[PDB]
Design a protein around this ligand. Sequence first.
Ligand SMILES: O=C1C[C@@H](c2ccc(O)cc2)Oc2cc(O)ccc21
Length: 217
Amino acid sequence: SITAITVENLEYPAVVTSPVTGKSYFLGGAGERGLTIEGNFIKFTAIGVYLEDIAVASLAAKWKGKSSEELLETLDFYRDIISGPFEKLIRGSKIRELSGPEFSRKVMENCVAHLKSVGTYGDAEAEAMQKFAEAFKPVNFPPGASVFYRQSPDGILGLSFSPDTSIPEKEAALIENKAVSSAVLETMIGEHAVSPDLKRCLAARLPALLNEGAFKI
Ligand SMILES: O=C1C[C@@H](c2ccc(O)cc2)Oc2cc(O)ccc21
């Protein structure tokens, strides 16, 4: 019942299965991110957000029987996606070649931004971020190079890099800090995430599922 999304010739499948935790996610929504200089928006990377199947049953708890327009203006609904008792997978596939650090910089930027936004950015979180950046250093992402973030409900972030848009088998690293976990996703679909790219998508495709209250295969 669920379909795919190509964002600037970078395709995001309808479903996916982690070689790491054998879970199976569904494309919640795709989108793209980039920079705005001189009123021009140059897109650098595509972005798709995946939710584990067990997410429908969970969100159905309070979001079923509501429509796109309705959820889209509801913040809680997102705090629920980002902090849901389930794994979320976020895949960023480059549109413009960026190095590990060049990129890991903008990302780490909005993160700490939020961490302080809610008084969670302390020593531990700080080390976790150091680590976060130590992971991206050896890397580089020419177009098609994907980064895979696994946000585990157990308060862990699974970092894994690729030269193309196919998920790797093993992971680059694991950042074990509950805060830093949600961070990424929060910076993309959170309250303070200006772009309605991911938000509109999620708001549009989930009710279709939420009406059945289940998911698997
Ligand atoms: O998916 C991206 C792209 C990234 C980025 C854009 C332009 C650039 O030059 C380097 C990195 O910024 C981000 C910041 C975030 O908090 C979350 C996701 C992203």
